[PDB]
Structures are given as structure tokens and as C-alpha cells.
């Protein structure tokens, strides 16, 4: 019954080593970061590499993987014309048809 993706505190290299042994992209484990006491790190395999995402807590202790910031409001608009505004649906912004 306990989750097989939770490894607790393990060194970054052993996370990569194990996942590097996997075959499929998406092979993952949660591990308690050693370089940041109290923080969790998400290790994920893709191709011939292992990616690392630091789990983040907000002011209310909610978990999330971060946001994508822009230097301006219009750079956000234009960027969302090639990339969907929803990450669960395909919605690309287009100018109002006057």
C-alpha cells in the first residue's frame, strides 16, 4: 500500500543513477532534498537525462512546481499565442475580431 515513488532522503546522484537505469520517460521519484532541509525534489527521466524539479510551498503551505514569469503584461500575451493558456486544454490567444 505505501507509495513506491517516495524514497525519502537520498543523494542526487543515486536518484539519477536509478532513473538512468529505467527505460521510459516519466519514471520518477520524490526525494527529500539534502541541499535544502525540509524541501522535496522531484526527479524525472527523459531520454538520456534526468531532470530535477524542486517542490515549492507557498504562504499557505500548498505544494506546487512553480510559475512562469514575464517582464511585461504584453510579453505574456504574445507568448500565449504560440503556447496554450491552459495546460489541460488547447487554447491559443487571438486578437478580438472587430
Amino acid at each position: 500500500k505505501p507509495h513506491p515513488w517516495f524514497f525519502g532522503k537520498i543523494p542526487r546522484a543515486k536518484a539519477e543513477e536509478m532513473l538512468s537505469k529505467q527505460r521510459h520517460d516519466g519514471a520518477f521519484l520524490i526525494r527529500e532534498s539534502e541541499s535544502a532541509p525540509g524541501d522535496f525534489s522531484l526527479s524525472v527521466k527523459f531520454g538520456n537525462d534526468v531532470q530535477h524539479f524542486k517542490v515549492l510551498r507557498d504562504g499557505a503551505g500548498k505544494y506546487f512546481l512553480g510559475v512562469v514569469k514575464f517582464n511585461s503584461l504584453n510579453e505574456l500575451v504574445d507568448y500565449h499565442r504560440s503556447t496554450s493558456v491552459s495546460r489541460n486544454q488547447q487554447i491559443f490567444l487571438r486578437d478580438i475580431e472587430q
Partner: peptide, 6 residues
Amino acid sequence: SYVNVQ
């Protein structure tokens, strides 16, 4: 280090 931080 991490992908989701610049």
C-alpha cells in the same frame, strides 16, 4: 541544478 528555477 533544478529545471523549474532560473
